[PDB]
């Protein structure tokens, strides 16, 4: 079984290739990690398994969802440590994903009622909505096109957050540069309409993610930094003329950062919008570990690793309804269906840790 052939990811010896994709669950009440999170990850932690946490705020402006966790305050760090310990107790590797939603926010999630920051002033279209604290759907407001100096301050938030993540005990961090959020708002030419050093040409559009990746590498080391991107996705009006070209531009800058740093990154993570060729082109271009995600199943994951299309495969949806997805895949057991209705609720058990095992 290819998915169970050991894999060496930096200084981490993984026992299998089943990775936990980052998934927002809104159980971190008031943005503070809760005991529920400890059980949730513990139930699904496995010896030599790699897990990626839900997106975590890097500033009081990095939120666009309700009750999402953070790593910018000493309180949050204290609670994450308790969670990290339970995950390590079971022998799993866990990376903390730093998440800034950019323009994908709302006044209710912006301290002082200020508009969410982004690369452009164009708001996400009406066909997309945001989850409000009371469960209703809200309209995305007009964002503010940040100045060159604030980009440096956002980058600083990633750096400080990565350091905070290490203080909490995480084995590393993952940069959330996909699904139309802040970093993706700079990468996609359908959004980035800047006329300065960060807009226009692909090289300019990729500058932001480059500075962010460089900042975290200089804080905790490239071996403990993963990068997630999505060259072709329509989420929150994040489109690009040539998705492949954009993906290859990011990959090219990641390979260069590794050469200049003298160490490879932890991995490259690309989510699919499920041609096949888009994924294979980046994997062949990236000099390092490649993780694939999006619409993968037990059979589809095995084929990707056996054919050399990816080194690790992360599962999202199937790891919500299947706490023991790793074991199930090993035995080819039936997989449980998920109830989307409880994806973003606040119940510490119902739809979170109540899913039956084998
Ligand atoms: C409820 C839910 C929350 C998610 N949260 C995030 C997130 O916070 N960050 C992210 O990059 N992707 C997030 N995703 C996308 C998943 O990481 C993944 O790409 C998707 O679930 C595809 O999984 P699959 O391969 O099992 O079909 C989320 C998906 C779901 C269903």
Author numbering: 10 to 283, 301 to 384
What's in the article?
Like in the case of R283E, the monomeric structure of R283D is nearly identical to that of the wild type (RMSDCα = 0.32 Å), with loop L6 almost entirely missing because of disorder. Structurally, it is unclear why R283E prefers to crystallize in its monomeric form while R283D prefers the dimeric form. Nevertheless, our crystallographic data show that substituting R283 for an oppositely charged residue generally affects L6 conformation and thus the dimerization process. Regarding the variants, the results show that substituting residues R283 and Y364 had no significant effect on the enzyme's behavior during gel filtration.
Jasmonates are phytohormones that are pivotal in mediating plant responses to various biotic and abiotic stresses and regulating plant growth. The first crystal structure of OPR3 from tomato (SlOPR3) showed that the enzyme crystallized as a self-inhibitory dimer in which the L6 loop, a critical loop involved in substrate recognition and coenzyme binding, from each protomer intrudes into the active site cavity of the other protomer. Based on these observations, it was postulated that the formation of the self-inhibitory homodimer represents a mechanism for regulating OPR3 activity and, thereby, jasmonic acid biosynthesis.
